[PDB]
């Protein structure tokens, strides 16, 4: 629905270019300069682009802005990791008299072109605290991280047998070295946490599964 | 340098209104032309309006006209936004942006951003989370490190921030985003990576905020009362 038109999402490996399009009309791009914002992850936008083509200091050679009609485009050359953010164009419309945005592009970044080699997840398994106990609740944490790519599947065992009931797991996000984390919790009672010889967490990457194991009285 | 802070996270019922605020500094205040961007999770920017500082004019977007209102005091150089008859598809991160420098509102564009106060609109009832300590492993090896945490336990609505000792430990920290729980509610957990030798000769604590409950902990994680080596 916004004014501006881009892609919803481009990807490239490291050291490519890649083009973000945004399309817009005779009464924005067609007669007024554009503007373009990189908002990595987490943080505000900050100003890439203005004018079309002119960048702020800081901003390296490698970002580069064009229009031509009543389009604009952004290249990136020399794609690195840290560029992955949401690029949004930008430009004043006279038709409605102020800025207009368009809808944003998501910019991933992915492994090496030559094949980025796979990464096991590492699993930190923690029981519940004395103090969570005291409060008559229990929850197993499960982190899980530096995995590639990024996905996985968790399970739960008590003993040996799968339990579904009480697990919630996030989806995988991505950490400052490029490779990916997820978490997962599994609550209880602090009875059940009594019930059984231990809990798992059993982590599967790409075929091969790491598990982690815990149980109410050990000293770990 | 051009500073820009915004008041904290905030939650609010549907039908009620919300007034953030946005100090400036670094610059001659009433120079500028100061926007604001809002923008819900997922999803773009969308431009609120304008106001100039000087003789406080503003311009609004005309779908928020006549509910939104822009006021600035320039002696605490600080602008505000209030939006009123919230609802829940005004639930969003509201930006304050400094112009980059235009002496007309046409032509005028955010270039200078603050960091964004998020605004939640929801029916659903307000919670501060629960935080416990993540105790660090028992077991001692030369070179050995141990990961101990806090965890924050069911909160609503979204942020919450963490940080160690005060700010003072960053190294070896990863806090991971929260699960959104079947229930409704949030949790999340910070963990730290450290010596394992040095465990119970060092003092690590979790600062946890969650700004829309007003709730502020502070938890000493320390080794299990197990641990007969630290």
């Known amino acids: 629905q916004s004014v501006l038109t881009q892609p919803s999402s481009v990807s490239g490996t490291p050291g490519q270019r890649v083009t973000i399009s945004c399309s817009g009309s005779?009464?924005?791009?067609?007669?007024?300069?554009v503007n373009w914002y990189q908002q990595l992850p987490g943080t505000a936008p900050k100003l890439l682009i203005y004018g079309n083509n002119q960048r702020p200091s800081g901003v390296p050679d490698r970002f580069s802005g064009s229009k031509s009609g009543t389009s604009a485009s952004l290249a990136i050359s020399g794609l690195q990791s840290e560029d992955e953010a949401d690029y949004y164009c930008?430009?004043?419309?006279?038709?409605?008299?102020?800025?207009?945005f368009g809808g944003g592009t998501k910019l991933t970044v992915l492994g090496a072109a030559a094949g980025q080699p796979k990464a096991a997840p590492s699993v930190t398994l923690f029981p519940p605290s004395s103090e969570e106990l005291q409060a008559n609740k229990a929850t197993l944490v499960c982190l899980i991280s530096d995995f590639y790519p990024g996905a996985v599947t968790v399970a739960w065992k008590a003993d040996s047998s799968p339990v579904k009931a009480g697990v919630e797991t996030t989806t995988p996000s991505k950490q400052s070295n490029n490779k990916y984390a997820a978490s997962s919790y599994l609550s209880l009672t602090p009875e059940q946490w009594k019930s059984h010889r231990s809990y798992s967490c059993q982590v599967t990457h790409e075929g091969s599964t790491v598990e982690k194991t815990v149980a109410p009285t050990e000293c770990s | 340098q051009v500073q820009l802070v915004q008041s904290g996270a905030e939650v609010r019922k549907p039908g009620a209104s919300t007034k953030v605020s946005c100090k400036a500094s670094?610059?001659?205040?009433?120079?500028?032309?100061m926007h604001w961007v809002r923008q819900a999770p997922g999803q773009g920017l969308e431009w609120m309006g304008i106001?100039?500082?000087?003789?406080?004019?503003?311009t609004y977007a005309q779908k928020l006209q006549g509910r939104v209102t822009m006021t600035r005091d320039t002696s605490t150089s600080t602008v505000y936004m209030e939006l009123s008859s919230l609802r829940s598809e005004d639930t969003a991160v509201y930006y304050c942006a400094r112009d980059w420098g235009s002496n007309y509102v046409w032509g005028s564009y955010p270039k200078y951003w603050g960091q964004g106060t998020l605004v939640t609109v929801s029916s659903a009832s307000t919670k501060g989370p629960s935080v416990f300590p993540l105790a660090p492993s028992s077991k001692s090896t030369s070179g050995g490190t141990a990961a101990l945490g806090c965890l924050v336990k069911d909160y609503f609505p979204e942020p919450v921030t963490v940080s160690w000792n005060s700010g003072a430990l960053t190294s070896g920290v990863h806090t991971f985003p929260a699960v959104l729980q079947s229930s409704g509610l949030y949790s999340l957990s910070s963990v730290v990576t450290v010596p394992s030798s040095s465990l119970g000769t060092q003092t690590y604590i979790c600062n946890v905020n969650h700004k829309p409950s007003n709730t502020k902990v502070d938890k000493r994680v320390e080794p299990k009362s197990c641990d007969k080596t630290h």
């Open positions: 106001i100039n500082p000087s003789g406080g004019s503003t």
């Open positions: 005779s009464s924005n791009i067609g007669s007024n300069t």
């Open positions: 670094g610059y001659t205040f009433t120079h500028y032309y």
């Open positions: 930008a430009a004043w419309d006279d038709s409605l008299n102020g800025p207009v």
